[PDB]
Design a protein around this ligand. Structure first.
Ligand code: NAG
Ligand code: CL
Ligand code: CL
Ligand code: CL
Ligand code: CL
Ligand code: CL
Ligand code: NH4
Ligand code: NA
Ligand code: NA
Ligand code: NA
Ligand code: NA
Lengths: 217, 211, 198
C-alpha cells in the first residue's frame, strides 16, 4: 500500500537547477519526517535533508546547506528537493525515504542527477586479438574520453553476451571517463566470425559501431 | 558530527557461515542505530532498528547488538540471497550519518587469471596518446598486484585499474589495468610488460612494439 | 495529582537525563523537563512530537508549572502507550532547533508506588506487601533498609529473614522496582517504616 515514486532527476550544469519530486501514496506525507539520501556512483549512502511533520522544519547536510531546499506540498502528498548551485559531488542517485521505527522504512526507487559542464562523446579504439594466438582469444573495445557517464556497450547488437566483461568506467586525470569492454571467443572463429562492439553514449547522442579485427602483421 | 566506522569494508564468506559486521560510533548515539541491506540497482532495505529489533519480514538469522558505541550485525547462517552490501546508520542526531558499508561477497576456490596484453591501436597513436591494456580474466580472489614494465623499467603513477563485480555464474572477478603514455614516450621504447602476482605466483605477458 | 508530582519530584532528583519519562501502570506515560524561567518562554515556544512504530507522528500539548525553575511536561494519550515498541520523542524549539531527542520503551521506565504494610516480628522476620493496584507483582524486586544497611530481595519475594544486637531498636523500610530483563525503571519511594526493640 505504501509507495514512494520519484522523478525529476536529469542532466544539469552548474549554475543550472533541478527539482526532484517524491510522490507518496498509502500514507499522509505531512504526518511523517521525510528524508532525502543520495548515493554517488560506486559509493555509500549520504543523508541530504529532512523535513518535519506538521511544522515543516528543515534540516540539511552541511555540504548542501544554502544550495538545496527540501519542501513538501500536502495537497499533492509530495516532497521535493530543489537543487541550485550544483557541483560534481552532487552527481548521484537521490532517494527519498519515510521515517519509521526510528529509521527509514520505505524508500523510493531513486532518480539520477548527473552534473556536467561539458558533454563529450567517446573515441572508440580496437583491442585487437592475436590471430596467431591458444584455443581462446581475447578482444575488445577501448571507449575513451567521454563525459558525463554513462556509456553502454553491447557486442554484435546484443547477440554476443557470453564471455563479455564491460568494466566500470574510471575517471582519468583529464576529467574524462574511460572504459573497456572485452569478450573471450574461440581462436578458430577469428577468421570467420565478425565481432562488432556497439557503444552508445546517450548524453552526446553518439553511437559507435566498431568491427574489431585480428591485427594484420 | 557523528562518525559511523564500519568494519570490514568487505569480506568473503560461504553459504552457512556466521558473518559479523561491526559499526562504531564516534560518540554516543544511544541505541538509535539501524542496519540496511542493498543490492545493485535497488534501494536499501531496512533490516534492523533500535540496534537489535528485526524489521517485519526479516528472517531470524539476522540479529543486532549494542555494546556502548559498538554495534554489531550478525548473520547466523549466510544464505545465497544474503550476499549484498550492508550499511549501518545512526539517527540519534538530526544530522543522520551512515557507515561506509560492508560488501559481503561469495567465497570460492582460488582461480588463476587468464592474462592478455593489448598494444595501443594504430588509430589511437594518431591522437598523440597511447593506451596499453592488460586484462585479467575470470580470477579469484580479487586481490592481485599488477605492475607495468617498459623496457624493464617499473612504471608508477600512469596506470589505472577497473574490476568487475563477481560473476553470477562462477563468482570470479575480471580486472583491467590501463597504462597511459604519450605517443612520443611509447615510440621510444620497445618491450611492454604486464606482470600479475597473486600469492606465490607471478605471470608476465609482454610484447615488442612492432613485430 | 499529588502522586504524579511526588513521583516526578523523585525522578527529577535523580535524572540523569534532562528529558525524563516514567510510567506508573504500563498504560500511561508522562515526560517532563526542567529549565530556568524565561519571561517570554511558555509552552508555546516548544513543540513536543512523537512517533510510535511507523505510525503518523503526533503532537503532545505541553503543560508548564513553577518548581522550586519551570517544569514542562506532556501526558501521552493512553492509546499511544504500548510496551515493547520504540516510542521516539522530540522536543523542538519554535525556531526548529532540536532540544531533546529520545527513544524509550515504556516497560523500561516504571516508577511504582511504595510497598505497604511493612511488619516485623521476633523469630527478625520482615514481611510486606507489593505496591497496591499494581499488576505483575511476580516481577517486582525490592530492597530493605536497616537502621545503615541495605539488603536486596529477589523478585516476587515479600519476606526478609534478618544478625542484629539485643536491646536495640531497629527501623526498617522497603522500596520496590520492576526487575530485569523484561522490565526496568526506578526505585519507588521508601515504604512507611516500622520499629522493633530487639
Ligand atoms: C516565545 O514565543 C512568543 C510568541 O508566543 C515570542 O513572543 C517570544 O519571543 C518567544 N520567546 C523566545 C525566548 O523566543
Ligand atoms: Cl571513434
Ligand atoms: Cl571477419
Ligand atoms: Cl554477473
Ligand atoms: Cl527507555
Ligand atoms: Cl504502583
Ligand atoms: N537533541
Ligand atoms: Na514523482
Ligand atoms: Na573476427
Ligand atoms: Na589466483
Ligand atoms: Na566478473
Amino acid at each position: 500500500e505504501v509507495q514512494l515514486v520519484e522523478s525529476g532527476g536529469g542532466l544539469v550544469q552548474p549554475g543550472g537547477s533541478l527539482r526532484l519530486s517524491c510522490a507518496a501514496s498509502g500514507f499522509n506525507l505531512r504526518s511523517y519526517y521525510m528524508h532525502w539520501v543520495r548515493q554517488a556512483p560506486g559509493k555509500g549512502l549520504e543523508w541530504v535533508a529532512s523535513i518535519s511533520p506538521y511544522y515543516s522544519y528543515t534540516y540539511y547536510a552541511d555540504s548542501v546547506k544554502g544550495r538545496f531546499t527540501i519542501s513538501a506540498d500536502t495537497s499533492k502528498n509530495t516532497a521535493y528537493l530543489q537543487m541550485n548551485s550544483l557541483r560534481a559531488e552532487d552527481t548521484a542517485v537521490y532517494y527519498c525515504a519515510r521515517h519509521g521505527y526510528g529509521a527509514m522504512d520505505y524508500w523510493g526507487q531513486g532518480t539520477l542527477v548527473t552534473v556536467f559542464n561539458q558533454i563529450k562523446g567517446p573515441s572508440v579504439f580496437p583491442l585487437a586479438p592475436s590471430s596467431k594466438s591458444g584455443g581462446t582469444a581475447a578482444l575488445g573495445c577501448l571507449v575513451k574520453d567521454y563525459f558525463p557517464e554513462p556509456v553502454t556497450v553491447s557486442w554484435n547488437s546484443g547477440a554476443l553476451t557470453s564471455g563479455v566483461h564491460t568494466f566500470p568506467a574510471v575517471l582519468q586525470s583529464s576529467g574524462l571517463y574511460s572504459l573497456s569492454s572485452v569478450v573471450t571467443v574461440p581462436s578458430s572463429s577469428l577468421g570467420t566470425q565478425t565481432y562488432i562492439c556497439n557503444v552508445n553514449h546517450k548524453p552526446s547522442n553518439t553511437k559507435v559501431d566498431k568491427k574489431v579485427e585480428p591485427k594484420s602483421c | 558530527d557523528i562518525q559511523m566506522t564500519q568494519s570490514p569494508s568487505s569480506l568473503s564468506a560461504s553459504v552457512g557461515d556466521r558473518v559479523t559486521i561491526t559499526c562504531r560510533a564516534s560518540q554516543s548515539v544511544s541505541s538509535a542505530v539501524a542496519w540496511y541491506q542493498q543490492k545493485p540497482g535497488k534501494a536499501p532495505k531496512l533490516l534492523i532498528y533500535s540496534a537489535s529489533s528485526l524489521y517485519s519480514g526479516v528472517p531470524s538469522r539476522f540479529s543486532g547488538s549494542r555494546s556502548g558505541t559498538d554495534f554489531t550485525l550478525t548473520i547466523s547462517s549466510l544464505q545465497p540471497e544474503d550476499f549484498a552490501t550492508y550499511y549501518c546508520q545512526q539517527s540519534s542526531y538530526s544530522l543522520i550519518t551512515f557507515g561506509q558499508g560492508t560488501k559481503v561477497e561469495i567465497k570460492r576456490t582460488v582461480a588463476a587469471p587468464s592474462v592478455f596484453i593489448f598494444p595501443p591501436s594504430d588509430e589511437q597513436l594518431k591522437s598523440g596518446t597511447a593506451s596499453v591494456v592488460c586484462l585479467l580474466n575470470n580470477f579469484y580472489p580479487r586481490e592481485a598486484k599488477v605492475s607495468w614494465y617498459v623496457d624493464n623499467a617499473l612504471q608508477s603513477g600512469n596506470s589505472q585499474e577497473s574490476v568487475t563485480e563477481q560473476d553470477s555464474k562462477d563468482s570470479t572477478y575480471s580486472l583491467s589495468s590501463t597504462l597511459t603514455l604519450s605517443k612520443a614516450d611509447y615510440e621510444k621504447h620497445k618491450v611492454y610488460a604486464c606482470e600479475v602476482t597473486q600469492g606465490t605466483t607471478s605471470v608476465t605477458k609482454s610484447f615488442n612494439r612492432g613485430e | 495529582d499529588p502522586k504524579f508530582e511526588s513521583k516526578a519530584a523523585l525522578l527529577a532528583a535523580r535524572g540523569p537525563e534532562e528529558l525524563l519519562c516514567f510510567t506508573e501502570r504500563l498504560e500511561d506515560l508522562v515526560c517532563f523537563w526542567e529549565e530556568a524561567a524565561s519571561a517570554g518562554v511558555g509552552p508555546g515556544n516548544y513543540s513536543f512530537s512523537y512517533q510510535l512504530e511507523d505510525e503518523p507522528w503526533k503532537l503532545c500539548r505541553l503543560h508548564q508549572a513553577p518548581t522550586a525553575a519551570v517544569r514542562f511536561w506532556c501526558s501521552l494519550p493512553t492509546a499511544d502507550t504500548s510496551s515493547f515498541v520504540p516510542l521516539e520523542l522530540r522536543v523542538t524549539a519554535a525556531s526548529g532547533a532540536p532540544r531533546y531527542h529520545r527513544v524509550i520503551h515504556i516497560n523500561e521506565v516504571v516508577l511504582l508506588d511504595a510497598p505497604v504494610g511493612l511488619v516485623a516480628r521476633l523469630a527478625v522476620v520482615l514481611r510486606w506487601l507489593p505496591p497496591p493496584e499494581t499488576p505483575m507483582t511476580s516481577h517486582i524486586r525490592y530492597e530493605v533498609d536497616v537502621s545503615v544497611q541495605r539488603v536486596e530481595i529477589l523478585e516476587g519475594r515479600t519476606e526478609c529473614v534478618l544478625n542484629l544486637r539485643g536491646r536495640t531498636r531497629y527501623t526498617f523500610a522497603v522500596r520496590a522496582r520492576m526487575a530485569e530483563p523484561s522490565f526496568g525503571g526506578f526505585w519507588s519511594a521508601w515504604s512507611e517504616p516500622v520499629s522493633l526493640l530487639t
